[PDB]
Structure formats: C-alpha cells, structure tokens
C-alpha cells in the first residue's frame, strides 16, 4: 500500500545573479551565501568556499 507523506528540502539560489543553483560554491564563513559557477569564476567572494553538488 502507498500513501503520500509531506516533507521539505533545501532549494538554493546564487546570491549574485539570483538564479536557481544545484551545483554551487558555498561560503564556509557567511551563514547563507552561495554562488553559481559562472558568478564564482567572475566575481569571487573574499572567503573560503566549497563546491557542493
């Protein structure tokens, strides 16, 4: 038997271009700062970042 269960998930946007991102450079210092790959390679953030997918 199957039923529906409601749950949540995280959805990310690039803090710079405001676009939806799944692969993202995540700031290890800011609380809530992510960049798309293009913005990472264009306007680089002055904190250590990690690339998450």
15 binds Zn ion (CB under 5 A): no
Under rule CB under 8 A, how many of the chain's residues touch a copy of itself? 18
**What is the rounded distance in angstroms from the CA atom of residue 45 to the CA atom of residue 5?**
39
Instruction: Verify binding: residue 17, a copy of itself, rule CB under 8 A.
Output: no
Among 17, 25, 28, 33, binds a copy of itself (CB under 8 A): 33
Checking DSSP bridges between strand 20-21 and strand 24-27, what pairing results, if any? unpaired
Please classify residue 12 by burial: count the beta carbons closer than 10 Å to its beta carbon, then call 0-12 exposed, 13-18 middle and 19+ buried.
Answer: middle
Site for Zn ion, rule CB under 5 A: 14, 16-17, 27, 29-30, 33, 36, 39, 47
């Amino acid at each position: 038997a199957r039923t529906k269960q409601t749950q949540d998930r995280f959805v990310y946007t690039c803090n710079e271009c405001k676009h939806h991102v799944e692969t993202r450079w995540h700031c290890t210092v800011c609380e809530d700062y992510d960049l798309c790959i293009t913005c990472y390679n264009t306007k680089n953030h002055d904190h250590k970042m990690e690339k998450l997918g």
